[PDB]
């Protein structure tokens, strides 16, 4: 559904 790019912090 969504890309997590390098260096991209992600909080589900």
């Amino acid at each position, epitope marked *: *559904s969504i890309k997590i*790019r*390098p260096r991209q912090a992600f909080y589900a």
Partner: antibody, heavy 127, light 110 residues
């Protein structure tokens, strides 16, 4: 500016447990998935598993009966425990930060690559 | 054989260009995007390409990546001696793990 550093025993006796830690500095565990990858001398790369900052994990099926990972967001560290080791586990172990695709169904995080790597630490399984 | 397959070695003279294949299947490249690594022996792999075709900062434009079907390709133009290294492709596989190709040794013919 984020740096990763492995810490490990060097030598481990066969049948015993290998424990490694990775320290993240100049950044934080928060908001990322983190992995261990290993490489026996002269051989290819093998992904071991990932752990999210909140503690959820996924492990390589080839290692499921022996491996676990944990995270200490307070110390900005995460760890590996690999049980019942043999010479097949002799390898340089790297910690790394992950990226990929996140699904809001059962799939969750699909790890497609590793952008930041530690320098790696050699673990030799031997008497 | 491993899930992702690469030719064991590729070579060309300095200044020439090369490609490196990454052979996958519907369970990996078919569904997920490919990343590539350069590894000089004794040091950690370095990310060269992600999301099939994108370069991180610091990676020169003579490195490129593409994906088609269930395969992927790394391209290197303007070969320099310093490019000699082991190159790996990787992505997620439906067996629920990240998988790497077996690696391709690039030799710059001297």
């Amino acid at each position: 500016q984020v740096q990763l550093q492995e810490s490990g025993p060097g030598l481990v006796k066969p049948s015993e447990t290998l424990s490694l830690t990775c320290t993240v500095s100049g950044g934080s565990i928060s908001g990322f998935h983190w992995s261990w990858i290993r490489q026996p001398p002269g051989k290819g790369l093998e992904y071991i598993g990932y752990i999210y900052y909140s503690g959820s994990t996924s492990y390589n099926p080839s290692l499921k009966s022996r491996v676990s990972m944990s995270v200490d967001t307070s110390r900005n560290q995460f760890s590996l425990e690999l049980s019942s080791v043999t010479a097949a586990d002799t390898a340089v172990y790297y910690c790394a930060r992950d990226f990929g695709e996140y699904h809001y169904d059962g799939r969750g995080f699909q790890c497609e690559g590793f952008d930041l790597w530690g320098q790696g630490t050699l673990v030799t399984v031997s008497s | 054989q491993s899930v992702l397959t690469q030719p064991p070695s590729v070579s060309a003279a300095p200044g020439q260009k090369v490609t490196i294949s990454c052979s996958g299947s519907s369970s990996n490249i078919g569904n997920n995007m490919v990343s590539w690594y350069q590894q000089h022996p004794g040091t950690a792999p370095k990310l060269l390409i992600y999301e099939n075709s994108k370069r991180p900062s610091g990676i020169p434009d003579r490195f490129s990546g593409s994906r088609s079907g269930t395969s992927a390709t790394l391209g290197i133009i303007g070969l320099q001696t310093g490019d000699e290294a082991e190159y790996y492709c990787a992505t997620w596989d439906g067996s629920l793990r990240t998988v790497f190709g077996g690696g391709t040794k690039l030799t710059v013919l001297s």
